[PDB]
Amino acid sequence: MEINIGIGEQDRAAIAEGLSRLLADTYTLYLKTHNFHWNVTGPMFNTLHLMFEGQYTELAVAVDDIAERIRALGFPAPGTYAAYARLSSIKEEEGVPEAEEMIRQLVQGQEAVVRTARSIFPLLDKVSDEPTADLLTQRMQVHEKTAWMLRSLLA
Amino acid sequence: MEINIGIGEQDRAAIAEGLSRLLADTYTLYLKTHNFHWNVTGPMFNTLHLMFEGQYTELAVAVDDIAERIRALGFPAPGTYAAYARLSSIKEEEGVPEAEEMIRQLVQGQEAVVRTARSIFPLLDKVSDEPTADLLTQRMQVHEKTAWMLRSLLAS
Amino acid sequence: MEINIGIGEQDRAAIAEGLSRLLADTYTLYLKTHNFHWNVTGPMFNTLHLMFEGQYTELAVAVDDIAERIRALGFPAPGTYAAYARLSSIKEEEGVPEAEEMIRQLVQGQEAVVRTARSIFPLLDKVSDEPTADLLTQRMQVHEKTAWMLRSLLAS
Amino acid sequence: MEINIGIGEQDRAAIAEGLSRLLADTYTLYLKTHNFHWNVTGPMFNTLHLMFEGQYTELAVAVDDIAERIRALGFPAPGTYAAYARLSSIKEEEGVPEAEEMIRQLVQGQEAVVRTARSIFPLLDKVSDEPTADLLTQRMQVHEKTAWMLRSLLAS
Amino acid sequence: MEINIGIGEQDRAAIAEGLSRLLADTYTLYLKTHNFHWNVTGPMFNTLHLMFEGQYTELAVAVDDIAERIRALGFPAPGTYAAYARLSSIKEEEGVPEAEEMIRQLVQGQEAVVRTARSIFPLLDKVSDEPTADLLTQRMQVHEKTAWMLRSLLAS
Amino acid sequence: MEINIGIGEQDRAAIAEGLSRLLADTYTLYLKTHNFHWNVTGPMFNTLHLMFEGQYTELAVAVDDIAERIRALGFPAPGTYAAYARLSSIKEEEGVPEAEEMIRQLVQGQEAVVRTARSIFPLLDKVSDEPTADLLTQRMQVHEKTAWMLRSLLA
Amino acid sequence: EINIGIGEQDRAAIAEGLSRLLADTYTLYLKTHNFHWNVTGPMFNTLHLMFEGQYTELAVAVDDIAERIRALGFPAPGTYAAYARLSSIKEEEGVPEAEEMIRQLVQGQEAVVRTARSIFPLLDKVSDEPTADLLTQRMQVHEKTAWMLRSLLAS
Amino acid sequence: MEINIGIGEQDRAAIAEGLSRLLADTYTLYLKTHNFHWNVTGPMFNTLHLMFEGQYTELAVAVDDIAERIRALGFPAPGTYAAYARLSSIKEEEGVPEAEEMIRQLVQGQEAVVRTARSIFPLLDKVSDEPTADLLTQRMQVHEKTAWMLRSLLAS
Amino acid sequence: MEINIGIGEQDRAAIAEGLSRLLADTYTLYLKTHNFHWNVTGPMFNTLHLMFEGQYTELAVAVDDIAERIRALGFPAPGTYAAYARLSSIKEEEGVPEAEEMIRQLVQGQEAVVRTARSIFPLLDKVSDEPTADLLTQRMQVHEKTAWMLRSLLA
Amino acid sequence: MEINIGIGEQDRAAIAEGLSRLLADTYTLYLKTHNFHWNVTGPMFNTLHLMFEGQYTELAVAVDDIAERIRALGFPAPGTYAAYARLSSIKEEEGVPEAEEMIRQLVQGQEAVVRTARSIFPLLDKVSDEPTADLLTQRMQVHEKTAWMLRSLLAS
Amino acid sequence: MEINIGIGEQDRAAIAEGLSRLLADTYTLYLKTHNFHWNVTGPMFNTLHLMFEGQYTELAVAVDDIAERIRALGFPAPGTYAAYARLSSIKEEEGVPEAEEMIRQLVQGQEAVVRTARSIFPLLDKVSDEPTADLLTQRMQVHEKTAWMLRSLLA
Amino acid sequence: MEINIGIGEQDRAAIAEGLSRLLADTYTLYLKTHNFHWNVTGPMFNTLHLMFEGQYTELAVAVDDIAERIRALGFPAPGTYAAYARLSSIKEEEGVPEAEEMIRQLVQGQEAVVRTARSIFPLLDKVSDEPTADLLTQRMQVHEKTAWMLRSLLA
Ligand SMILES: [Cl-]
Ligand SMILES: [Cl-]
Ligand SMILES: [Cl-]
Ligand SMILES: [Cl-]
Ligand SMILES: [Cl-]
Ligand SMILES: [Cl-]
Ligand SMILES: [Cl-]
Ligand SMILES: [Cl-]
Ligand SMILES: [Cl-]
Ligand SMILES: [Cl-]
Ligand SMILES: [Cl-]
Ligand SMILES: [Cl-]
Ligand SMILES: [Cl-]
Ligand SMILES: [Cl-]
Ligand SMILES: [Cl-]
Ligand SMILES: [Cl-]
Ligand SMILES: [Cl-]
Ligand SMILES: [Cl-]
Ligand SMILES: [Cl-]
Ligand SMILES: [Cl-]
Ligand SMILES: [Cl-]
Ligand SMILES: [Cl-]
Ligand SMILES: [Cl-]
Ligand SMILES: [Cl-]
Ligand code: NA
Ligand code: NA
Ligand code: NA
Ligand code: NA
Ligand code: NA
Ligand code: NA
Ligand code: NA
Ligand code: NA
Ligand code: NA
Ligand code: NA
Ligand code: NA
Ligand code: NA
């Protein structure tokens, strides 16, 4: 069936490509947060183990919300290691950092997702895509709140 | 008491007029979806009976949310067959279509509500009615998601 | 597939027609109650907004129970503005009455549905349809209880 | 202690005999539905696995309700394979039919329980056993609704 | 506001008189059960303290259902010691019986409520009061089930 | 088995007699509140129907708490119309008052239960029965709160 | 095709064993349900409740066993004729005294355990850890239930 | 650690200052509503005690949402009587007004918070802070809805 | 309608004045705890954010309980910034202390409320106001428990 | 930090010593009740297994409440077999008594805890420790209720 | 601190290596299942969208359970695209297959995880690591149940 | 009534003896963990007060499960201070250690329970007691996970 939602196909394609980067960054942050949840040690173990659990649980919902918007626009949602590695701007961490460096990297990760979200708003400038704008806004809100909670631990 | 929310009376009346159309389209889609929930048959009965139930349950809440926004603007919320027949832009189905045609009509219905919402946005941008703009945005999100799920069923 | 539930097709058709009137009245009362929920004002706002919400929430379940009995008898459940306007005996209200008149109209609405339910029992005279009789009975119970609560508000 | 509930002992015995047949048929349909839940295959697996689960869960409660009514009347509730094989009127399926034949058999099973309940009503009318009549009415309501949902799957 | 539910005033008064007897019986059995819950002793303490709690909790709801039906018919619901002592057919117990005698009295109490309910049906048939008949039927179901559970405790 | 809880039998009997009056008053107020819940009419119907429901639901628990304290002291809990009518100081209402008179009577009923509870403390002053004193105090707290809510409606 | 490391002949033999376990469990389920309805005497309330807990558990157990048969690629039996043929539970067509009901339910638990024990040799030279775990869980439940039941028969 | 969220420090500080105003107005409305909840009397006591409770419960959560956005921007959230008395535009009520005047003051309070929120959008437009704009919009929605419910109570 | 709860009007006014001070101290501590919840930083952020949330949630219930007792006694409950600043003995904190100083101040706050509660018991000496005494006792219990939890962090 | 709760250190130490005896008695009764829950047999198994579970579940909460009051007073809470064996006045039971003797011992245990609690009030007379007095009162209330339920099982 | 759980360090390292492969396969199947959930179309959309959601939700918990057993053994849990792509034996799908091919690939994926689990059991039997053996048993149970449900759709 | 669950009386007695040691160790760890929950202080108070609460709550359930398995085998479950002191291999702490020493003792306590469990498997293999072996395996899983979380705090 045709897709008749007030956005041309070329614009929908461009928006889906932007949201694909957002999905890749969100998913990459999801796994890094999960990773640090398992692997953190030291006197902050209990508090960070729990904090990182709350974060990755939220990000698992977020990846669905972003993927579903891509589908609503009429495009497949990427979902493989190869696709996400190509699309993601998150810095990979292959070892086990000290707890304070884990915190720092997760702050940087929140800010990287915000930066990707901000990069999509220009694609919406000439277009009427209020739902996508709202999704970007909700993601920025969560990541900016999470950045505050994380960087507070480093004070 | 006067209404002092940063939107003048003429503009609030115009927003209420638009939301009355959105309310009527949402209600018409609600009743059509409820109808199809009762009346669908064929091998997809269990999946569509359930899917249409989720949809009309969500739409019943949306009807309340739209009507309450009209009230917050200072105007009566329409709520009769006669009013909704005039205000709506969705054709009702008077018979019992095959399941695939029911699906197609509900795709078109989602898009008709999005189209009505789209007709109201320029007014909201002009007068800066941020809460109504957010309401319309949420409706567009829901309807565009539901259109994806429905049309997916028609793919080969 | 054949329907073999101890009621012949001609009787099932007649009972389904009667229940179609009950469905239309119940749905029309549902929307009127929803309408008054949004639109009531005055010192009784909070209590009537809440009371009417309880009522239309219940009526939304009731319309399913009625429509599903029609389907069990082997007939399509009506569900459009045109079909309900034709079948309904509820008096339409296109304006915004005072709170006390909203209450009076909803009492009349309860009693109108009861009258419609009572009108169906003769169709069951010569047939064995205990489930339909029970459905009518349950609706009469709910509407008679609601009528007491509503009219109590109009006493001194 | 004496049982003084307005029905004499011989009539209570007769009602308990009838309910024993209804219990056996309900239990036979319960086990058949549970069987088909485990064993159904094909593209309708997910939806029929779930649909049949809802049905056998409901029937498990019904068997308790029927057995407890026999106890209230002063008689033991039958509860063995031998008793249910004798008292039932539903043929069990010993193999694994295709999904559409499973559905067809469950339609016929609902109608079989209705037919057994129908066989008991003249006695209940004669001795005015209101609680048992209401129990049979609820069972007919459930089975007739379930028959609609099942046979709908066999339509085009 | 008038009551127009298909039953004339003198007939509604007659139904309310019957239900006032049923309410008084039910409330008196409620307090007796509550009393025995507090006061039972012996090796059956835990089981009877719990069983009686379940019963009086249910009866507290039932007294509401009965009182509300009286109100729906247009009459005040009795609710004093003097009114219930006058209307009730339950035997008063001013002491603390042995556990087995408490059980026996509670069996008789269930049957007293059933007997009152059974006396009301002919009037309901005459004037076609279907909701009240269903109320009576549901109470008979609960009380006849409870009588079975209670008297079972007295067997060998 | 003997009762050895630090209170002699004659004192326990006297305390149980006082609590029997409290139980009778509480139960009589319970039924009056239930009665007015069914029978109230007028423009306050919805609010008073609900308010009175909350009150009699609470009173149903209270009668259990009082009866169980009587049992813990080693005495039977009264539980019949004749016993409560004999013991109760609540004024009986055989008709259907107007809503404002229902409210007034329920205020008086709360205050009557408080008066009965207060009448028991002198007995405890001699004996040291801390759990009974606490029960009386809880009942006074509830009834004094409820009296405020009720009389506010009449302001 | 089914490639879970077992091979169809062993899957068939294990499924036959689990078919006996299913029949015994289902037959005990119905017998427990029967005794729940039909028990009388001073133990009525406690046995009515105890037997309800047991048959509620067994209703879940029959699903767990049937699903394992399906995972092994065989149909789950489910008729009176099939269960009469497969089951080793002693049938009871009357209404025993409460103490004899308890005794028969003890014997029923032990019969299910005996059937479960008979299946473990079918898992020699097979890698079927999930079936072994299922048998183990059923033995745990029935051995616990047997203790609770036989405790009622002690002096 | 640096804050790199696409908004420079000077603009974050200015937005946080605006949100500090909103927090103070929300908290002052919270305390006023809580106060009126305790102190309201008259025949509307039950309805207003409950309505004001729902409002202050909601506002207790709202102050968290606003305070947390201030923290996300990198600034401390004000939280003392001195700070809120200074920052707020809402005149507190030091006495116990009649119920109608409590309602009127709470309507005015909703509109004062809305006015404060509307005062912040100009800053956000120039700098692009979408999350803060969404927070403002959500608060405006709640307060405009609440203003409708409150002022409805004052109608004739 | 008159208030007849066994306490004369002059005594009720005196008790209500005492409770007004308790309300003001409890509310001031409520807002200080809420403040520190938002504003705390450092490695204890997660645990103190949560701990302070539990505390202010409890104090919000407590201010209702205290205010409602004032209303039950027949007097208006105070509820403005000016009324509470006038009545409160809590030391105000206009800045953002280090986490350890936040903890110390919250210990002091618990002890200040206890002090205010203790100051009211003499009024209840000549007068029998058992519900108010119980309310004071419950507040002291809660605040003394909270003080232990807080000061343990500084050990 | 200093402890400034209006009780001097020497008095807090004496109160903590009394509460340590209460904690030891409560914990010893907790384990004895848990023991009897596992080990009871006979026709009362189901009712006593359950009753003792309710009791030990409550006692597990109480040991926390008592221990936390010791900590609030500024002293360590004892928590070892040696510490409790030294402090406890409960009679130890190393075997498996008959069910009636288990009940009797648990009655004696409730009364022993009450005796210990009562022994502490003299300390609180000279001092002002209202929270500790309330804790003692709540424990006495629970143990006196439980003693009634237990000894009722031993009545004729 | 020493790890003294009855398994020597070299053996724990070898078990962790095997569990790292199992984690990688489970995570790859998790993402593939999540992918197919978003991207499936055709008349089976509703049923497969829901079924695949149930599966990936379960796998998300399983990933946690496997990773935390690795931690309990004293080794870091791998958690990056590069690590999983190196360790995983699952075939990734970079396109959008038809619904029946998605089902077939998910059947293969269940059987692939079972193969990996089966390859680890000999080490666990040699070492007597009973908790890890139970974990692998539960994974085999779930994947074998899931394989039945999936392949039933293709009959 | 006889016990016929496929294990002879002397072998059941031997299993019950092993489980009696396991029960005693689990109960001793339960009380030590409960003690440390009450008594821990210092900057880790919030995280350890909570962590130790979760642990003792879980252990309270574990003692029931172990005790009930002894009963299912036909033997009394030990349940006194004297029995547990005799049977237990955990040394109790009579004082109030620093938080880090509390953590270390609780790690050693987890490993002590595991050590007792491991000693019992040869008997269970010999007589084929599968339910007891699963119980031991579940306890080892919990204790090995808990040891990891505890010792991580010391890194
Ligand atoms: Cl995101
Ligand atoms: Cl990054
Ligand atoms: Cl919409
Ligand atoms: Cl359309
Ligand atoms: Cl009408
Ligand atoms: Cl209706
Ligand atoms: Cl049936
Ligand atoms: Cl059939
Ligand atoms: Cl009744
Ligand atoms: Cl009687
Ligand atoms: Cl009271
Ligand atoms: Cl009075
Ligand atoms: Cl089994
Ligand atoms: Cl057997
Ligand atoms: Cl204002
Ligand atoms: Cl706000
Ligand atoms: Cl306080
Ligand atoms: Cl301070
Ligand atoms: Cl205690
Ligand atoms: Cl003792
Ligand atoms: Cl896995
Ligand atoms: Cl694969
Ligand atoms: Cl353990
Ligand atoms: Cl150790
Ligand atoms: Na999804
Ligand atoms: Na609404
Ligand atoms: Na429906
Ligand atoms: Na039952
Ligand atoms: Na009621
Ligand atoms: Na009770
Ligand atoms: Na199943
Ligand atoms: Na917060
Ligand atoms: Na309040
Ligand atoms: Na604790
Ligand atoms: Na985890
Ligand atoms: Na237990």
Residue numbers in the entry:
A (entry chain A), F (entry chain G), I (entry chain J), K (entry chain E), L (entry chain D): 1 to 155
B (entry chain K), C (entry chain H), D (entry chain B), E (entry chain I), H (entry chain C), J (entry chain F): 1 to 156
G (entry chain L): 2 to 156
Paper text:
The protein, termed Pa Dps, adopts the Dps subunit fold and oligomerizes into a nearly spherical 12-mer quaternary structure at pH 6.0 or in the presence of divalent cations at neutral pH and above. The 12-Mer Pa Dps contains two di-iron centers at the interface of each subunit dimer, coordinated by conserved His, Glu, and Asp residues. In vitro, the di-iron centers catalyze the oxidation of Fe2+ utilizing H2O2 (not O2) as an oxidant, suggesting Pa Dps functions to aid P. aeruginosa to survive H2O2-mediated oxidative stress. The Pa Dps structure harbors a novel network of Tyr residues at the interface of each subunit dimer between the two di-iron centers, which captures radicals generated during Fe2+ oxidation at the ferroxidase centers and forms di-tyrosine linkages, thus effectively trapping the radicals within the Dps shell.
The screening of crystallization conditions produced two crystal forms, prismatic crystals of a primitive orthorhombic form (Dps-o) and primitive cubic lattice crystals (Dps-c). Structure solution and refinement resulted in a Dps-o model containing 12 subunits in the asymmetric unit. One sodium ion and two chloride ions bind to each subunit, and 82 sulfate ions (acquired from the crystallization solution) are associated with the 12-mer. The 12-mer assembly forms a nearly spherical shell (23-point group symmetry, ~9 nm diameter), which surrounds a hollow interior cavity (~4 nm diameter). The Cl− associated with each subunit is surrounded by residues in the long loop and residues in α5. The Na+ is located at inter-subunit sites coordinated by H37 from one subunit and D64 and E68 from the second subunit; only five of the twelve D64 residues coordinate a sodium ion in the structure, and these may be interchangeable with water molecules. The Dps-o structure revealed the presence of a Na+ coordinated by ferroxidase center ligands H37, D64, and E68. Each pair of three-fold pores along a three-fold axis exhibits distinct microenvironments, giving rise to two types of three-fold pores, termed here A and B. In the A-type three-fold pores, residues near the turn separating α1 and α2 form the pore trimeric interface, which is defined by P43, N46, T47, M44, and E100, and in the model contains an SO42−, which forms water-mediated contacts with the backbone N-atom of N46. The electrostatic surface of the A-type three-fold pore interior is positive, which probably stabilizes the SO42− ion, while the electrostatic surface in the immediate vicinity of the pore exterior is negative and is surrounded by three patches of positive potential where the SO42− and Cl− ions in the structure nest. The Dps-c structure is nearly identical to the Dps-o structure, as indicated by the 0.38 Å RMSD deviation observed on superposing the Cα atoms in the dodecamers (1832 residues).
